[PDB]
Design an enzyme around this catalytic site. Structure first.
Site, PDB file in Angstrom:
ATOM      1  N   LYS A 164      34.152  43.020  46.146  1.00 45.71           N
ATOM      2  CA  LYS A 164      34.990  43.356  47.039  1.00 45.71           C
ATOM      3  C   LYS A 164      35.044  44.821  47.286  1.00 45.71           C
ATOM      4  O   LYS A 164      34.987  45.000  48.507  1.00 45.71           O
ATOM      5  CB  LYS A 164      36.717  43.372  46.354  1.00 45.71           C
ATOM      6  N   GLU A 190      48.622  50.604  42.598  1.00 48.28           N
ATOM      7  CA  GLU A 190      47.467  50.524  41.892  1.00 48.28           C
ATOM      8  C   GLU A 190      47.686  50.633  40.264  1.00 48.28           C
ATOM      9  O   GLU A 190      48.101  51.480  39.832  1.00 48.28           O
ATOM     10  CB  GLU A 190      46.755  51.791  42.442  1.00 48.28           C
ATOM     11  N   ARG A 191      46.714  49.934  39.555  1.00 47.68           N
ATOM     12  CA  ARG A 191      46.695  50.425  37.994  1.00 47.68           C
ATOM     13  C   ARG A 191      45.748  51.837  38.022  1.00 47.68           C
ATOM     14  O   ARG A 191      44.867  51.788  38.842  1.00 47.68           O
ATOM     15  CB  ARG A 191      45.889  49.256  37.142  1.00 47.68           C
TER      16      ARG A 191
END
Ligand SMILES: Nc1ncnc2c1ncn2[C@@H]1O[C@H](COP(=O)(O)OP(=O)(O)O)[C@@H](O)[C@H]1O
Ligand SMILES: Nc1ncnc2c1ncn2[C@@H]1O[C@H](COP(=O)(O)OP(=O)(O)O)[C@@H](O)[C@H]1O
Ligand SMILES: [Mg+2]
Ligand SMILES: [Mg+2]
Lengths: 470, 474, 470
Positions: A164, A190-191
């Site tokens: 990705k 987002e992490r």
């Protein structure tokens, strides 16, 4: 002059009281900048967004950050506009949070920079472009099977470790090289570990220098997680409307955006809709998505990663999102293991974008023959293994020998891949990929080994690779 | 101003009039010495959450302000104790003697303060270390099933920290107090007490303490993390912390959400779990890794809180009662389990030999249905089935018996290089045991080389050692 | 001082106190009222203080019916919670939630020791932490769910699967042997069952060491809320003062939470998931944590737990699971097959089976029984279509023994004679482990499967097959 006071603090929700004639509009930003008067107090620098007018000159707001340490009677300042973030060339090569403050260490934006509101109506009906225009990416598999539309919404599906982030950086590189467009990346929920990883990967790519970038971390409150996508969209809209160019917008997890909206609705106390989602699901999605379009002076096209809540595609979030897609692209771990990068298999996109107009005469005949050939080979793959190794070997070897060469020729050498293996990487026009696949379907190149077709650009380089290997 | 009077009380909360200068999240004291936490500031009253027994408070009593946010004691002295979500000892043994404090609500590290995770956390379980590796700075959810042994995974991981220079903090949330004591006696025996510090908030305690316990544990971990140490934190049940918070927010009359949970239940656990980070070298190089544990009631992970935590973490380890009864223990479902750091969290020797192991296991799982028909298969499928049976045998393990990483790597190498495909699938366990003894006797050079270089030894010498052992196996 | 009644809504009553002397929470209140005329009735009622409101007012929960109360009636604050007698005087008697004997054998003297119902639970330093096995004489349990002396036992199951029959068999098998005191608490279940159990205890003679407390389905929710705490106080006295070993039998501790949820809405709380009270886990832990053994004595607690629709994810059973040392889960499928007691052999975690004690002899047999029964579940869906021919060679060897192991796990109970036409049997663990080892070795593959049903020792299976004509 107008400034209010805090009257209620209930988690991420704050109520503010204003004089009678100077209540803020319903999306304005409010500032609290308090210095601790004594050791019984604390410093706070919070931002609030007006959400509702309750009556009695009070408004209900949502905090963009933690509300610990607030005190009733604290003074609030009305900025007189929505959250306004900086736009232009200064955004390039930087990382921002929702409020437009850089979260990188490379300094801060000067106070005289220009800033645009995060809230804004969509372009008018008259301002939209009158016809469809294919966005050429230089990637053979996409530009043949799943061509992007200028102004279109493309759904990116895939697993893990399938490529990705390499496909994203390659799209950013090819678009900025061959068309001259910038891009904005907007990670929603987002992490933080993954945000640090993405920043250092993209830095090395110097595609960070095009990338301009906004993050909304998983540990921020729901208002910030709701609005980070709008701040990214505003930074892209600047380049569409001012510089008159084609821009790319990437949204990591539209599902997290809808989930944050649902959490905010629960906080504000609205009645839940079906399956627990907020009653305004469709309106909120439409307000975000309708600002991504092509105008007479440029366009925005968006790659959006979509999480299906239980692998149920009829669930309201996936349904409302799929209502806006013009295209799709799926990535296969099977191909990533076979060594076929990009690892793409993007079928739904064929039907809308490709078929009717543009490609429909030349390129649609080639693309339909490629799809039929690869579908035949999948059916053959079960029988091939035992019986078919012998039994295919005359009749079906004509199909399989050509289908494996088509499957290898769909792979490609990416510019961004040069850091994994010493290959410069290539950009292949749409008429060249239409050409090469027409030849392979005609059997011009059957004498060449299958391996010659792998991880290459135009068809000629296949001839060169074969001549080099014998 | 700075004092008020109680106007309502019951169910562990009280409404007060006054305290105009109280701030959100401030600690507050009633006339008896019972503490409370100011959570709701409304127009004319204050909603206070009581951190002790509330039955001694009456309408019309005074209430007074302490002027400070929640803080927790921190320091080397907490090591070897048992404590409250507040710093209070619970083991006997006298006071703790800390010298300083930390807020319960510190900010997490930013984007710019982190380094990618790159060093392993050895659990001592072959299946975990090989197929679902955990790194320092990672968050990994362990989703167990109450008939399998799901809690022993965390307790054996903690006991394995003894030579690895790591501090740990077991947090028990809403557990039965005689089981948290059974855990303390188990860790004590191990001298694992001697690093392990322990926070407990049992089911009999007030809801606010159960709600604060994981934050107190993380706040005690961050002290050592920012000094430069590596700490491991185990959350025994986050779903019970979520239930305690839901109870408080319903009693304060806030809008309900999906299962009567408030709108900020996701943000609660995001706040918690994003404090586990791997700090960058300019920040000291310390780390903090979290292992939340959850007990299922049949395999269902579709509850709201389990879905939230699944979305927040970096991976999950799955244990199933169907595997546990069919003889596969530890009973990890390698297909469903995932780690997103994986690879980066392994030493070179392991990363060399784990990929082939994964391939063999996956092929075996997809071939299982053909095994019933063995007499009829081609030789390739028969080879695949033979390899899969042996792989499953070598991944078995006995509860409370950890293995050193070098021995794990050596036995996995023996399996994936073909040396083990002569033995009957029923001799594989015994073969492994006797091989470990043989290594202890005369593979010291190989063991030392792996320990020192984190890399595979010389292949020819390794092959000679394995063949030599086979020359004495029976 | 004196208060007045203000509102009456079924079980919940609002009382106002005049001079600023409000009763504390959990205090008992008395309403004693002789009729003033022929348009009234006499009242003798008890209330428990639950909440403080503003304007000098309290919410209380009635411990009896509220019919007949008038607004304005005088209420007396007794100054303390509900208190019940403790000691030898309680042995052999039957009480209600208030400590009043409901048998016909007199009344307790006024000066006797009388302890309060509400109490903090024992601390971490004073808990007992060692596991001794308890032999029940029931094959499935003693093999696949061993009970702990001084631990907590839970018997889960939906309606009509055999929880009460099993509780009565456990009393029958253990109480006479026990060298201590027994306590029984009936919480919201059948008065007919209570009368039966009392008369059986009387006839046996065990009643001379037993205290019984009843609050049954016909009681208002206050009684069903507090009867378990009355029984617990009576047991705690013997654990603490006399250092005795105690057996605590509670029938359907689920009714305790159900009664709480009945009153919650009238108290004014917002509903939680599945309509329960928000304080379910807190209220349950308050009671459960007091039932434990210490350094001064032990309480061996066996509780029957109702699972509302065999749905084990229901919050009440789901929360109870975290308090139990061992469980037995009863299965409707077995009940419908006629396999009593109908214990599901997996779910029990056999937890006491916690490898050491059983570990050499018993653990290998117990795990081999569970492995055989796990394989048979997987086979049952295959078995129907494909499976009975294809399985007939390899897997029929597993099925043939799984059918027999499953029939041999059933047993005939002493207290089930009115259901079985037989007297009961008592099987020691040695004989159980022996018999199951024989069946697994194949020493009995030739006997018909029906001979294994509802017997004790394996010699009884052999005899029954002989009688059948084998
Ligand atoms: N075009 C490519 N050429 C060569 N290797 C690639 C290519 N695309 C992906 N990879 C390999 O696969 C990995 C996928 O990384 P990444 O794109 O970040 O994974 P993900 O799909 O999770 O986002 C790369 O680090 C690289 O090893
Ligand atoms: N051991 C047993 N032997 C024969 N019949 C039984 C046995 N256990 C239960 N039953 C049948 O099941 C019925 C209901 O059992 P009961 O004790 O009422 O269970 P519960 O309390 O769970 O409803 C009994 O009336 C009886 O007919
Ligand atoms: Mg990725
Ligand atoms: Mg019953």
């Amino acid at each position: 002059m107008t400034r209010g006071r805090v009257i209620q603090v209930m988690g991420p929700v704050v109520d503010v009281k204003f004089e009678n004639g100077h209540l803020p509009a319903i999306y304005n930003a409010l500032k609290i900048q308090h210095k601790a008067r004594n050791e019984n107090e604390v410093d706070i620098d919070l931002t609030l967004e007006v959400a509702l007018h309750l009556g009695d000159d009070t408004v209900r707001t949502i905090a963009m950050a933690s509300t610990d340490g607030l005190i009733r009677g604290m003074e609030v300042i009305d900025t007189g506009a929505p959250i306004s973030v900086p736009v232009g060339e200064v955004t390039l090569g930087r990382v921002f949070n929702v409020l437009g403050e850089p979260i990188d260490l490379e300094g801060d934006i000067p106070a005289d920079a220009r800033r645009d509101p995060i809230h804004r109506p969509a372009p008018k009906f008259e301002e939209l472009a009158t016809e469809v225009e294919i966005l050429e990416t230089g990637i053979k598999v996409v530009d043949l099977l799943a061509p992007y539309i200028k102004g279109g919404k493309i759904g990116l599906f895939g697993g893990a470790g399938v490529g990705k982030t390499v496909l994203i950086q390659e799209l950013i590189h090819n678009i900025a090289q061959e068309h001259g467009g910038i891009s904005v990346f907007a990670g929603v929920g987002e992490r933080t570990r993954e945000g640090n990883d993405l920043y250092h990967e993209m830095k090395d790519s110097g595609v960070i220098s095009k990338t301009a970038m906004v993050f909304g971390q998983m540990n921020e409150p729901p208002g910030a997680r709701m609005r980070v996508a709008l701040t990214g969209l505003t930074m892209a809209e600047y380049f569409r409307d001012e510089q008159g160019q084609d821009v790319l917008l990437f949204i990591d997890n539209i599902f997290r955006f809808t989930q944050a909206g649902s959490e905010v609705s629960a906080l504000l106390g609205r009645m839940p809709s079906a399956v627990g989602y907020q009653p305004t699901l469709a309106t909120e999605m439409g307000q975000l998505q309708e600002r991504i379009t092509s105008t007479a002076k440029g366009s925005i096209t968006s790659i959006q990663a979509i999480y299906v809540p239980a692998d149920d595609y009829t669930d309201p979030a996936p349904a409302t999102t799929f209502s806006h897609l013009d295209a799709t692209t799926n990535l296969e771990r099977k191909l990533a293991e076979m060594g076929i990068y990009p690892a793409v298999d993007p079928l739904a996109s064929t039907s809308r974008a490709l078929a009717p107009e543009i490609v429909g005469e030349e390129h649609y005949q080639v693309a339909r023959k490629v799809q039929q050939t690869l579908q035949r080979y999948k059916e053959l793959q079960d029988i091939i293994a035992i019986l078919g190794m012998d039994e295919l070997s005359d009749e079906d070897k004509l199909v399989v020998h050509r289908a494996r060469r088509i499957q290898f020729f769909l792979s490609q050498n990416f510019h961004v891949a040069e850091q994994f293996t010493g290959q410069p990487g290539s950009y292949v026009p749409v008429k060249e990929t239409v050409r090469g696949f027409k030849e392979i379907l005609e059997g011009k190149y059957d004498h060449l080994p299958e391996d010659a077709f792998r991880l290459v650009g135009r068809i000629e380089e296949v001839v060169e690779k074969a001549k080099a290997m014998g | 101003s700075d004092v008020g009077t109680v106007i309502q009380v019951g169910d562990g909360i009280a409404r007060a009039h006054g305290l105009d200068n109280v701030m959100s999240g401030e600690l507050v004291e009633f006339a008896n010495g019972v503490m409370g936490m100011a959570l709701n500031l409304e127009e004319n009253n204050v909603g206070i959450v009581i951190l002790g027994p509330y039955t001694g408070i009456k309408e019309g009593d005074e209430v007074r302000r302490t002027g400070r946010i929640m803080e927790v004691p921190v320091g080397e002295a907490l090591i070897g104790r048992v404590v409250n979500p507040l710093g209070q000892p619970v083991d006997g043994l006298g006071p703790v003697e800390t010298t300083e404090t930390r807020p319960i609500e510190s900010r997490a590290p930013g984007v710019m303060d982190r380094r990618s995770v790159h060093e392993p956390l050895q659990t001592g379980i072959k299946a975990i270390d090989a197929l679902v590796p955990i790194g320092r700075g990672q968050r990994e959810l362990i989703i167990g099933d109450r008939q399998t042994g799901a809690a022993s995974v965390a307790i054996d991981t903690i006991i394995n920290q003894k030579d690895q220079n790591m501090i740990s903090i077991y947090v028990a949330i809403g557990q039965k107090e005689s089981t948290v004591r059974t855990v303390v006696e188990t860790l004590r025996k191990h001298g694992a007490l001697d690093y392990t510090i322990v926070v407990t908030a049992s089911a009999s305690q007030p809801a606010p303490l159960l709600f604060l316990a994981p934050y107190a544990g993380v706040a005690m971990g961050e002290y050592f993390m920012y000094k430069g140490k590596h700490v491991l934190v185990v959350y025994a049940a986050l779903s019970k912390q979520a239930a305690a918070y839901r109870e408080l927010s319903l009693l304060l009359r806030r809008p309900p959400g999906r299962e009567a949970y408030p709108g900020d239940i996701f943000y609660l656990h995001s706040r918690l779990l994003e404090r586990a980070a791997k700090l960058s070298d300019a920040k000291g190089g310390g780390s903090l890794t979290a292992l939340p544990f959850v007990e299922t009631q049949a395999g269902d992970i579709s509850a709201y809180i389990p879905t939230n935590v699944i979305s927040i973490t970096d991976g999950q380890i799955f244990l199933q009662s169907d595997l546990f009864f069919s003889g596969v223990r530890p009973a990890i479902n390698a297909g469903l389990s995932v780690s997103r750091v994986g690879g980066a969290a392994q030493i070179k020797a392991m990363k060399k030999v784990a990929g082939t192991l994964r391939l063999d296991l996956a092929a075996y799982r997809e071939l299982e249905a053909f095994a019933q028909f063995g007499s009829d298969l081609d030789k390739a499928t028969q080879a695949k089935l033979a390899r899969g049976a042996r792989t499953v045998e070598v991944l078995k393990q006995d509860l409370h018996q950890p293995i050193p990483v070098e021995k794990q790597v050596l036995i996995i190498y023996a399996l994936t290089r073909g040396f083990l495909d002569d033995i009957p699938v029923e001799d594989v366990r015994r073969f492994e045991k006797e091989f470990y003894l043989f290594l202890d006797q005369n593979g010291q050079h190989l063991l030392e080389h792996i320990r020192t270089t984190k890399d595979l030894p010389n292949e020819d010498d390794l092959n000679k050692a394995i063949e030599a052992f086979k020359k004495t196996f029976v």
